[PDB]
Design an enzyme around this catalytic site. Sequence first.
Site, PDB file in Angstrom:
ATOM      1  N   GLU A   1       0.795  -1.204   0.000  1.00 55.36           N
ATOM      2  CA  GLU A   1       0.000   0.000   0.000  1.00 55.36           C
ATOM      3  C   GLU A   1       0.831   1.259   0.000  1.00 55.36           C
ATOM      4  OE1 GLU A   1      -3.179   0.222  -0.054  1.00 55.36           O
ATOM      5  OE2 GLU A   1      -3.672  -1.876   0.423  1.00 55.36           O
TER       6      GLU A   1
ATOM      7  N   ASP B   1      -6.910   6.795  -4.187  1.00 53.74           N
ATOM      8  CA  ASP B   1      -6.447   5.456  -4.369  1.00 53.74           C
ATOM      9  C   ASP B   1      -6.556   5.026  -5.839  1.00 53.74           C
ATOM     10  OD1 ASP B   1      -9.013   4.507  -4.653  1.00 53.74           O
ATOM     11  OD2 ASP B   1      -8.853   3.169  -2.915  1.00 53.74           O
TER      12      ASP B   1
END
Length: 162
Positions: free
Chosen positions: A11, A20
Site C-alpha cells: 500500500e 487510491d
Amino acid sequence: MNIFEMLRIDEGLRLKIYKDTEGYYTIGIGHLLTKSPSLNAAKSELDKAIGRNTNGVITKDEAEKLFNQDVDAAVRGILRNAKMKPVYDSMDAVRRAAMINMVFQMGETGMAGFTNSMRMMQQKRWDEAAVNMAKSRWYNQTPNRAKRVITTFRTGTWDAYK
Ligand SMILES: [Cl-]
Ligand SMILES: [Cl-]
C-alpha cells in the site's frame, strides 16, 4: 516478513490525502477515508479518525496508528465472518497473512466473490485456487499486487515479497 511489513509494501505510505486506484480519498497506509467525491468530506473524515484538525496532513506516527487499527479490524472481521473463519482457521500462518491482505484491501464485501477460491483454499488445492483467483476484477485492476498475494497462497512462502 509479517502482515505489517507485507501490507506496508503493498500500500505504500502517504501523509497527505490522496486518491487510491479506484479514485477514493485515502491517507496513510491504505486507510480509505471515504467513497465520496468530496474532498471536504474526506477532510472531515480524516479529522474524525485522528481526533484533531489535521488540514489533510498527518504524521508518520498517526499513519501507523491508523494502520494498527485497520489491520486489527481486518483480522476481527475475518474471525467474525461465518463463512471466512473456517477458511482462515484451516490455514498456516503465511497463507493467513495473504487472506488478511485481501480483506484489508477489498473489505468483507469484495471477499464475497471469492467464494469458490476460498473453498479450494480450504481443500488445500493451491494451484487451482490461484488460477481461479486470477479470474477477477481484482487481479485485472491491480495485477502486480494481486500476483504477489496469489503467489503467497500458492507457495505458502514469502518469496514474492523478497
Ligand atoms: Cl478510524
Ligand atoms: Cl498493483
